[PDB]
Amino acid sequence: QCVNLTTRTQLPPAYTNSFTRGVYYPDKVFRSSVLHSTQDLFLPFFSNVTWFHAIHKRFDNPVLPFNDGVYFASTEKSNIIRGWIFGTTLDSKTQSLLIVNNATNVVIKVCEFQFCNDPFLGVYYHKNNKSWMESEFRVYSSANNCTFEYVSQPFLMDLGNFKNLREFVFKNIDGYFKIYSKHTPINLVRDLPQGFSALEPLVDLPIGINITRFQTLLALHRSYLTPGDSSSGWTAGAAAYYVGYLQPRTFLLKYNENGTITDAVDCALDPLSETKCTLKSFTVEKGIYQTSNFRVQPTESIVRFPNITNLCPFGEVFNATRFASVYAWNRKRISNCVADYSVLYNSASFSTFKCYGVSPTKLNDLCFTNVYADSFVIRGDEVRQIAPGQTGKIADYNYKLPDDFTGCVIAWNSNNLDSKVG
């Protein structure tokens, strides 16, 4: 079921300064009193993070892009925030990641979900007894084709007043969804607190899906004075959540006698910080130093190739009715075209595709100076003789490639058309 909570308009996004918060452990290795340098997707220190709230009486939980990674945070004594949804279209055309947390368990499902315009979790309280809580999921309209399902113990959640900050870095590398988190008390501060907190790995989900956008899920207590369908009646406490964006950066990390991260230095943040990266020590003495220059990061990629829109007059060399004999092999010049191998792969399946000097992948990116295709017909056991350095009848007496050959060899079966009965 869905309730169209409607924000008459989105309030202008509020920017708050992240205070050097959010550095996760790179790997599960015990390192003690050793400074370790790693280059990973990282939240830049002092970034402009979001200040999105929950109730002002708008219920604003808009979708935000997931470019590389999201540093999330939450500051409420009552657990208003529970889980997140990750996806690229969020309309049941692609595979989306569902994270939802109820009092007993945490359910992670990768399915084709038709998410509602304003999803939330419904908490219903029996009158005169808050103890009786019944929960109805108002996030997904339907689910289909679930690949990965995961159920486990609930993430630490609140059940001497204190506010518990929960920070969750989400990363999608090589089809792995890495989540790092750590909960700390909050005392006498209204915004993201100072100091250093290191996030420890919790799960490593092999979701293997495309993620482009994400949205925050809120658990709203139900008020029965006004009807459920209307935005009114879903009142909850005032909770503000932070969203940051991860950009690739190189951060030195400082461990301690016991093996926990205490301090970090980002080379990009300060010229002094860059000096620390070169010396490989947090302490720097008085003087002048020369540092390695890697403060510049690429921002765009430009591609320039000459004007040739013509598909190659291959002459259907691959599809040619008659090929050359091996004693007189035909060589054909290729000039003034744009070589596309995608059509050739669709046209026929090649049994042998061995390229030397140029990799088979990213070969379509590269320009080739001059192409002389040499074509012939042999038998199967002699195909290995085509490769340079190996000998045989064909290699010694019929056709020889040099040791420094840079090119490709493409061999495919032809028993259907090149074999005659009798």
Partner: antibody, heavy 126, light 109 residues
Framework: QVQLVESGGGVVQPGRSLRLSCAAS????????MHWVRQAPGKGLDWVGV????????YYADSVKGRFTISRDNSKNTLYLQMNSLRAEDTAVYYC??????????????????????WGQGTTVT | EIVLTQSPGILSLSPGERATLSCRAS???????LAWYQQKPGQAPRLLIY???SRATGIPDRFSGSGSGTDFTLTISRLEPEDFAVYYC??????????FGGGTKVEIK
């Protein structure tokens, strides 16, 4: 944009059968208690019946007895109603209306009644 | 099957004036069962007030309602030209029967 579509109208031969059905746009049709209101030509509104979220409890008004049956189809997004007879009550306009009181609202100890929020287009029953 | 009574049946007032409406119930009501409606001729009724002294979504602040026990009142602050129609009151309980009122009418003068 919520819209309930009436159907099965028109003047027929009086008695023994007539078909009414009410559709509902969107996917919020199920789990909302629904009622049927008949509009007399000159005598105001009246009641037909009520069905819950799952149809376990059903109740009918005292104006008519033993002639009306109410059922909901979840997949077709259409609620179905049948009259086993056609009495002298003619030219009555029948509306279908959705009441937001969901199962959870009466599940909670609170005793509350909301209002019939959205109504249908209407139809002619003779 | 509760005997509801609306008085007066017909009201004639100029636009911009104040009109009061009555809907009396023959039995005791827990002050959370009544609803108020406006019905223009030829169209479906529209929700105005649900429960007691609670305004529905989209209803302007000009419309008001009050009442408890067996006496209930609808009071309008100012009569718009589009607010001139017939009004009905009902009362419903989970096992209770649903009974609309005979109806009242406001008219131009």
């Amino acid at each position: 944009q919520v819209q309930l579509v009436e159907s099965g109208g028109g003047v027929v031969q009086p008695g023994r059968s007539l078909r009414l059905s009410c559709a509902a746009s969107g996917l919020t049709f199920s789990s909302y208690v629904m009622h049927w209101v008949r509009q007399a030509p000159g005598k105001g509104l009246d009641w037909v019946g009520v069905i819950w979220y799952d149809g376990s409890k059903k109740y009918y008004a005292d104006s008519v007895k033993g002639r009306f049956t109410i059922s909901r189809d979840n997949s077709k997004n259409t609620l179905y109603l049948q009259m086993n007879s056609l009495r002298a009550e003619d030219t009555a306009v029948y509306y279908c209306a959705r009441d937001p009181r969901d199962y959870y609202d009466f599940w909670s100890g609170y005793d509350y009644y909301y209002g019939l929020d959205v109504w249908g287009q209407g139809t002619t029953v003779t | 099957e509760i005997v509801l009574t609306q008085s007066p049946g017909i009201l004639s007032l100029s636009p911009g004036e104040r009109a009061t409406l009555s809907c009396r119930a023959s039995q005791s009501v827990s002050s959370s069962y009544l609803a108020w409606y406006q019905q223009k001729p030829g169209q479906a009724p529209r929700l105005l007030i649900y429960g007691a002294s609670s305004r529905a979504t989209g209803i302007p602040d000009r419309f008001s309602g009050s009442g408890s026990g067996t006496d209930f009142t609808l009071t309008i602050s100012r009569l718009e030209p589009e607010d001139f129609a017939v009004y009905y009151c009902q009362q419903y309980g989970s096992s209770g029967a649903l009974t609309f009122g005979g109806g009242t009418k406001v008219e131009i003068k």
